[model samples]
Target: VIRVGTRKSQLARIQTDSVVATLKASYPGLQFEIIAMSSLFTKELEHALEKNEVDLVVHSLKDLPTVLPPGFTIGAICKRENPHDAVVFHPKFVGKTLETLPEKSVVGTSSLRRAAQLQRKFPHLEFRSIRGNLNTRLRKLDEQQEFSAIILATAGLQRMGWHNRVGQILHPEECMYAVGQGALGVEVRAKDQDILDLVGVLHDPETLLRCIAERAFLRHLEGGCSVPVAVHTAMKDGQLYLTGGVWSLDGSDSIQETMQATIHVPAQHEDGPEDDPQLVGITARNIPRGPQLAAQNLGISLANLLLSKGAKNILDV
Candidate 1:
């Protein structure tokens, strides 16, 4: 039986079940068992994977660090959802958005990236770090008068089937998304060729390429909880465009830039299995190495462009 591990949460279960359902359909005779727990953040799952207790783990791509722990590789990245933040206003403010909210109205969010970027864009609104799961945060927003609205990822809300709650979708101009924000990553042992091959079919070429650029950008910039880094990516007629930004905590200083790179179409039949490689912790055996490299370089180049324009000072803070 294939063991699929995931966190013990409603959202986690939903994500995990959906991926398993897809795999089950593909491999009709495969037996699967799910093991759930409140992982030591992803560390517990990593340990389980290391010990061979689970064959693979499903994780919210954004929750994963740009640099993964040694010996694990993300075997697949499913198609992306809407990689943007959304505002869920309280009942009294249901029709209003961040722009229309009363002056000085407080907004709740848990991400430094969201707070930093939105703070600069909406100076009239106040941002406070709110913690807990979607239910808890929404409960607080519903029962308490302290917050006018709460910010969350559009993907999470959509996954939860809470479409009515997304009061406003924060576009890139208002808030660029966190790296890998709306993607699902399947983590497996790097050297386990069987597990790699099993999950490799699930990787969406577009999402994989876009997330590689985003992850590489974050990795190159050395960003995580301590820094506010945001990115927006789009694939056009044959080019990948990446727009990245960095901001200070107080939102007084920032740097943003965009760069583009050509994407290479994969050959009809790749030469050998030996040519497959990992990029930013992801391994897509059939994906084109040339496009992956281009995406990686695009992220690095954009980050370098931002750093050259005093992003270092902002990030250092």
Candidate 2:
């Protein structure tokens, strides 16, 4: 039986089950089981992976840290969802949107990126740390008077069939979403090539490329909670476009860059390469091992470009 690790929530179960169902249908006779616990089971897992207690973990890509520990690797990145932040309104304000909300109306969100951009876009609105899972946050908005409106990932609401809750969809220009937002990542032990390959079966090449660049931005920036770093990326034709930025906690200070990079199509090599040593290195080879690696490198290059333009200063704050 293949054990699938998932959070114990209605949304989590639905998403996990859908993905697992696809795998089940494809791989006939394979038994599957879900291990659920939104409330971490043991403090809990001090690398519970190596202990064999956990087989694989499904995580919201944005919540995962920039760097993973040595024992694990992300086996697959599922296809992306909307990847944009949405406005979910309180019932009383059903017809109203973020822009039309009354001045000084309270808008709730727990993300620094969302808060920063929202602050910049709607300074008239008050932003606060309204934290919890999807359900709790929604309850806080609709059933309670805790907020006039709340900001959430459009993907989450869409996935849960809570589409009607989205009062408005915020454009990327208004508020760029978090790195890896709206995507599901499957992580497994590094050495388990068989299992890794199995999980990767669901991988979407375009989403993988976009995520590669996003992760590279975060990894090189070494961004954390203390810093408000966010990104918007898309794969167009044969090129990848990445826009990344850093924001001061107050959103008063920020710098963003929009850049495009494409994986080089390998230069046609001479036919006599039985022992050709000259055909090596960046000077000779146009691309990396694969388009994916090129995507990753492009992301790193974009991060470096941002860093060159004083991103460090903004992030340092």
Candidate 3:
């Protein structure tokens, strides 16, 4: 039996159930159990993995730390959902985007990265900290008149079937979504090859490659949840493209960068194991050669490019 660990929240359970359903279909005989646990954030989850009480854990990719625990690695990154931030406007301001909101209109969000970047873009608007899940935040926005609008991830909204609530999908130029946002990540022990292989079935090669590049970029910057950094990645027409940037708390200063590389898509092999489709090819030869390398290199290079333009000073303060 495979045990899946997840938070007790409504959204977290929904995500876990999706993965469970997939596994049940793929492996009929495989029994599984959901181990509901207390609310553990990114750092705490790593501690749980070390204790080995849970065989697998599913997490919001954006919440995960760029540097993972030593013995743990991401086993699977499910195909991405919508990776954009959405605005949830108050009833008083039913028909408005951020640009259309009244001057000094208050916006609520808990992410320093989001707040920082948005503040820079909309200096006329005021940003305040908000703590809670999707429903709670909306409640506060309505009842307390605490905010004119609240920013949330579009993926969460879509998963909860609340797409109608999204006032707008903030563009990358306006506000880049979080790294690995909209992706579901499965964590497993690095040494457990059998478990890795079992979970690998859920891995999406394109999403994995894009996330790797974003993670590498964050790592190069050496920033965590508290830092004001954002990134978005996409693959299209045989090219891998990435957009990343850094911002200050007040949004007074910022730096952004973009890069792309032509990537070779792996060809399918008919003779391989009938069950496992080798989308990544061999680790040595099939991994998008120059494109994958370019992704990693470009991340670091762009970070340095930003730093040279005074990103370090903004971060230091």
Candidate 4:
């Protein structure tokens, strides 16, 4: 039996089921069991993997740390959905964007990144922290009048089959997404060749490169939940464009920059290491390493550009 690790939340379970369905098609004879545990924390599942409690863990790539704990690697990053923040308006505020919302209308969000950017962009609105599962958060928005709207990940809402919940999808100019947003990662023990091979088929090259760059940028800057760091990436015409930003908690000060690099994927050399390889906490086998390294370097280079231009000062506090 292959035990799949994931959270107990409905969205997480939906993600797990989708991944499992893919695996089942490839290996129909195998039995899979999902071990649902804690919320939002990949740490709990890493422990489960450490003890060999589960063969693999599925996680929202954004929630998984930029640097994983030793011995674990994200073996695969599946195809990404839209990586944008969505405004889920309360009934009273339906059809209203953040800008059109009444003055002093309270928007609930638990993300420092969202609050900082929205606070800067829409100063007329007030931001408040709302914590709970997506279901609970939605319930509160509908049942309580305190919040006129709540900001949530568009990917989550889509995966939950509640696409109608998205009142407006925030553009990158208004709010760049968190690192690794909209992608699902399959993590396995670094030493487990079989599991890595099993899940490696799930890797979507475009999503993998985009997420690698984003995670590398976050890792280089040492950004986390405590600070407001955001990024947007796109691959076009052999170039990977990355736009990264850092904002003070109050959004009073900020640093934002855009950069691009040639990301031509070449075939892997025959002499490369046989073991699964990882970069910025991601692992994949049989994929070309050249583009992977280039993507990683692109992120670091962009991060260095931000740091050189005073991202440090804004993040220091």
Against the true structure, whose lDDT is highest? 4
What residue runs in model 3 are displaced by over 4 Å at the alpha carbon? 39-48, 267-292
Tell me the tens digit of each residue's lDDT in model 4 across 209-285.
98889988999999864569999999988999999999998899998999999996443422336553578888765
Estimate the TM-score of every prediction: 0.96, 0.87, 0.89, 0.94
lDDT of 2 by residue, 1-317 (tens): 78887766677677788778777877879888777754243223315567766677677777666666565666677778899889988888759988889999999987888888889878899998898888899888877766999898899999889898888998878898888888887766766656765675666667766777788778888875335888888766677888988887778988888888875333332222212221111011112236656766777887898888888887776
lDDT of 3 at 157: 90
Angstrom error of the Cα, residue 302, model 4: value is: 0.5
**lDDT over C-alpha atoms for residue 6 of model 1:** 85
Error of 2 at 77 (Å): 0.7
**Per-prediction RMSD in angstroms?**
1.6, 6.0, 4.1, 2.0
Winner on TM-score (1 vs 2): 1
lDDT of 4: 0.87
lDDT, candidate 2, equals 0.73
Candidate 2 wrong stretches, greater than 4 Å: 38-46, 264-288
Q: Which pairs of residues collide in candidate 1?
A: none
lDDT of 1 by residue, 231-282 (tens): 9999878889999999998788988888988885453323237446678989
After superposition, which runs of candidate 4 have C-alpha atoms over 4 Å from their true positions? Answer: 38-41, 265-272, 275-277
Cα deviation in Å at residue 251, candidate 4? 1.1
Better of 1 and 3 by lDDT: 1
**lDDT, residue 152, candidate 1:** 94
